[PDB]
Amino acid sequence: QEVEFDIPPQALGSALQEFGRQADIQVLYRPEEVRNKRSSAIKGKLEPNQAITELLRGTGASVDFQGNAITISVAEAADSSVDLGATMITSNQLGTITEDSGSYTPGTIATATRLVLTPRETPQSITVVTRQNMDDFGLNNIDDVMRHTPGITVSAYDTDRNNYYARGFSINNFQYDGIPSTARNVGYSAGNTLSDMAIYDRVEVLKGATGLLTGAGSLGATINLIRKKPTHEFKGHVELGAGSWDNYRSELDVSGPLTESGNVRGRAVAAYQDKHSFMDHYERKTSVYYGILEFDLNPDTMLTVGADYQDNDPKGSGWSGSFPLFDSQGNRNDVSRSFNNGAKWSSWEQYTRTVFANLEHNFANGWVGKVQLDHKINGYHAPLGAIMGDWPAPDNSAKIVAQKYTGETKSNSLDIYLTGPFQFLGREHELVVGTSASFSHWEGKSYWNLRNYDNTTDDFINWDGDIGKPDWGTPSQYIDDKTRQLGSYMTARFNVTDDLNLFLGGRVVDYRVTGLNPTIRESGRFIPYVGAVYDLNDTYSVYASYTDIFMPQDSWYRDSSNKLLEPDEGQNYEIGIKGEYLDGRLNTSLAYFEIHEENRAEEDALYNSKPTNPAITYAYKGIKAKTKGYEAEISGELAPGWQVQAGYTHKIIRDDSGKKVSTWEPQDQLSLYTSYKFKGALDKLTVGGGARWQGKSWQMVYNNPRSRWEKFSQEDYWLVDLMARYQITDKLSASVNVNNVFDKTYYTNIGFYTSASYGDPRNLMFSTRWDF
Numbered sequence: 001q002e003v004e005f006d007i008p009p010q011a012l013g014s015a016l017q018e019f020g021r022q023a024d025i026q027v028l029y030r031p032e033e034v035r036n037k038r039s040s041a042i043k044g045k046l047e048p049n050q051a052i053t054e055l056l057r058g059t060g061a062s063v064d065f066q067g068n069a070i071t072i073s074v075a076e077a078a079d080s081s082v083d084l085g086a087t088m089i090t091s092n093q094l095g096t097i098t099e100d101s102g103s104y105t106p107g108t109i110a111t112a113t114r115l116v117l118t119p120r121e122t123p124q125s126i127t128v129v130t131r132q133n134m135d136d137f138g139l140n141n142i143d144d145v146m147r148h149t150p151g152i153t154v155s156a157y158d159t160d161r162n163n164y165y166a167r168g169f170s171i172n173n174f175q176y177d178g179i180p181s182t183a184r185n186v187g188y189s190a191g192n193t194l195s196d197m198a199i200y201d202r203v204e205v206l207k208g209a210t211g212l213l214t215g216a217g218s219l220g221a222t223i224n225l226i227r228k229k230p231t232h233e234f235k236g237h238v239e240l241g242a243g244s245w246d247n248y249r250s251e252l253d254v255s256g257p258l259t260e261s262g263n264v265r266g267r268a269v270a271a272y273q274d275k276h277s278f279m280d281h282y283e284r285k286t287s288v289y290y291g292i293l294e295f296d297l298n299p300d301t302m303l304t305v306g307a308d309y310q311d312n313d314p315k316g317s318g319w320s321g322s323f324p325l326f327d328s329q330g331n332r333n334d335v336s337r338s339f340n341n342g343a344k345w346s347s348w349e350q351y352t353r354t355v356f357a358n359l360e361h362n363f364a365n366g367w368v369g370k371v372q373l374d375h376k377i378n379g380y381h382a383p384l385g386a387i388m389g390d391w392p393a394p395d396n397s398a399k400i401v402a403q404k405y406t407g408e409t410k411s412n413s414l415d416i417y418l419t420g421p422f423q424f425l426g427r428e429h430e431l432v433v434g435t436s437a438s439f440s441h442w443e444g445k446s447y448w449n450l451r452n453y454d455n456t457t458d459d460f461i462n463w464d465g466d467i468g469k470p471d472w473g474t475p476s477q478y479i480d481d482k483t484r485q486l487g488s489y490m491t492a493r494f495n496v497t498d499d500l501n502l503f504l505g506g507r508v509v510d511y512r513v514t515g516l517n518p519t520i521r522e523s524g525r526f527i528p529y530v531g532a533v534y535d536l537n538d539t540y541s542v543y544a545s546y547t548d549i550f551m552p553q554d555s556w557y558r559d560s561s562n563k564l565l566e567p568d569e570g571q572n573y574e575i576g577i578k579g580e581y582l583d584g585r586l587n588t589s590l591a592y593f594e595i596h597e598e599n600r601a602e603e604d605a606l607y608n609s610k611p612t613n614p615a616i617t618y619a620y621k622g623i624k625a626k627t628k629g630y631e632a633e634i635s636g637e638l639a640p641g642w643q644v645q646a647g648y649t650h651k652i653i654r655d656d657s658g659k660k661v662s663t664w665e666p667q668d669q670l671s672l673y674t675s676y677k678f679k680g681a682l683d684k685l686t687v688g689g690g691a692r693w694q695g696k697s698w699q700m701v702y703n704n705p706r707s708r709w710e711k712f713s714q715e716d717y718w719l720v721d722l723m724a725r726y727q728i729t730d731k732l733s734a735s736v737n738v739n740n741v742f743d744k745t746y747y748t749n750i751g752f753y754t755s756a757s758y759g760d761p762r763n764l765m766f767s768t769r770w771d772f
């Protein structure tokens with residue numbers, strides 16, 4: 001719809017980049033196609049489709065309208081065969097925006113290598129949850145999004161922390177707009193489990209080994225969250241929701257030009273949610289604020305400054321699971337799903353804030369440079385109190401553990417990179433080269449020396465959280481940890497033939513951790529990157545890649561000799577086929593993959609039975625492990641108003657014992673989410689549904705009172721969602737979401753410190769949304 005334009009005659013490359021910007025659209029073009037060409041002048045209010053063909057007059061170009069993207073091509077009379085994965089330069093470094101795309105499949109993405117590529121062009125497993133998918137299913141936070149993410153399993157540590165698995169491993173890599181955070185442990189990492197989606201366009205999950213842009217990190221995957229950006233037209237909405245257990249949510253989002261020419265633009269979002277829960281005496285208020293301004297210093301240099309803020313403020317938090325598995329005599333405890341072991345005053349409050357600045361420049365080359373500066377804060381205030389241990393006792397009394405943790409981590413990041421195309425042997429290729437630095441500082445106080453507290457409660461069966469609050473006494477411990485990460489990286493994408501694209505790159509990493517532990521250091525560590533994509537027809541490509549990652553170990557992971565273990569490392573080997581239909585409106589993929597891990601920390605049973613180094617007292621042992629499995633997915637348009645996202649993933653991970661490991665992550669899982677937009681008389685109704693299933697999962701847990709190990713199983717189960725929206729008015733809609741329709745009762749945690757957690761019972765959410 002009608003946009004204000006001002007793009008004078010210049011190199012067609014520049015014009016296309018200016019167009020993408022002014023029109024809030026991604027423009028993809030082939031560098032050698034536009035190189036000796038110039039745009040014709042556009043001036044005024046114009047519909048973006050009229051506008052582009054007017055800009056291209058005289059250039060010989062054609063336009064492929066593809067939602068939030070256009071692609072430009074210059075056809076010849078000649079044409080000996082098509083080059084589907086030809087090197088394309090792009091106007092948006094983050095990819096295609098998903099907001100207003102109406103689709104559950106992404107456009108282009110840069111999660112893999114920093115190069116802006118389509119899913120078919122990326123030689124790794126890339127899954128995305130689109131803006132519209134979030135809107136349709138009411139996914140309001142990162143936990144809601146992970147639960148809906150093909151290939152991910154969400155399980156619970158406690159009421160205010162979940163765990164995300166992929167391919168056998170806990171995910172501990174998070175990016176924001178491609179900027180990696182420090183996530184060594186829960187210190188640096190408060191609130192990462194809890195981010196509200198109000199401020200984000202989409203969440204993009206790269207699965208396998210993602211050392212190339214993450215730097216030091218975990219195996220499994222990275223989760224990349226892309227922030228909402230300002231726009232050239234005014235727009236906003238307000239949203240109100242009410243759900244089971246007095247779950248109330250409001251949200252405001254406003255975006256647009258802040259000056260008459262449109263050279264400064266901003267976006268603001270505020271969101272607030274206050275809920276109780278099916279769990280007794282648990283509640284959580286969350287607040288989120290977001291502000292971003294874009295200044296055009298000149299038509300090819302842009303400055304962006306931005307801040308965000310999220311406070312997560314619960315009451316009735318637990319430390320570990322919702323209730324203890326065994327009672328005092330070893331019998332399994334049986335409790336309502338409402339049971340909550342946390343005390344009334346117990347709280348794991350968690351907060352995050354960022355300030356950030358970027359500068360982006362277009363070099364008359366077609367080359368583009370970017371500088372990203374981040375100040376990030378991850379704090380926590382955690383006076384925790386829960387029933388814990390083998391309780392009840394026969395008289396129905398039980399005992400509380402109570403500990404208080406406060407702290408804050410401050411991080412500063414600088415990321416600079418350069419990207420562009422280059423000719424080599426008569427063909428067009430592209431390259432990213434970049435360097436990064438992060439310094440991040442964790443400071444904290446801990447309190448376990450309670451003064452004159454009576455930690456017993458007379459009544460377990462009717463436990464309510466109504467116990468007293470202890471004198472925390474003085475701090476037990478001060479934390480001072482500093483982690484410093486330096487990286488340098490480069491990837492090149494060679495268009496070797498009309499059908500074959502070769503990916504060569506890597507990262508060199510420097511990682512120092514400093515503080516009250518003995519210093520931990522890796523210098524000059526190389527993380528390789530190799531992949532290829534081979535086109536088979538207009539529809540299908542096969543691909544293969546070899547990718548790597550490492551993480552220096554926590555300092556308590558020492559060995560026999562008191563030496564810190566070598567870093568936890570791994571390689572992902574992947575081969576697959578990806579399909580593309582309806583001009584990128586539908587994507588399919590099928591992959592086989594193996595993760596080889598090395599230096600996985602392992603207890604060291606034989607030493608640990610009788611320490612013999614006066615030196616250490618609980619040494620570990622560095623072992624190998626392997627993930628084997630395969631994965632199928634589909635996302636996009638099945639028929640004109642019919643959108644899906646679905647996946648199947650199978651895995652088994654074994655360690656150097658032979659024995660299966662990560663046995664809480666099911667060996668088999670499936671998601672299908674879908675919605676349909678009617679036409680004719682009912683074109684204002686959208687209907688929708690979804691199902692997630694997982695096979696058997698289990699844990700070995702030790703029953704102290706009976707002195708024996710036990711298997712705990714969660715049999716396979718299904719979960720079903722349903723959804724409907726009516727657009728009653730141009731400006732007003734109403735939705736209902738129903739979750740776990742069949743009220744399946746099941747576990748999200750069995751075995752975390754000998755405790756258990758239930759998943760959510762049937763719950764509804766009702767919302768209205770107002771678009772100005």
Ligand SMILES: CCCCCCCCOCCOCCOCCOCCOCCO
Nearest residue numbers: 234254255256266267268291292305306307
């Ligand atoms: C150093 C700290 C960095 C903080 C940056 C904070 C940014 C906050 O800016 C918010 C700007 O949002 C603009 C919201 O968009 C509304 C524009 O509409 C203009 C009024 O409409 C007139 C008629 O259309």
Ligand SMILES: CCCCCCCCOCCOCCOCCOCCOCCO
Nearest residue numbers: 733734735736738743762763764766767768
């Ligand atoms: C254990 C409890 C589970 C209960 C199961 C309930 C499932 C049945 O739900 C049926 C939903 O129909 C209710 C219709 O309400 C319409 C919602 O309209 C939204 C209001 O719009 C406001 C406009 O400003």
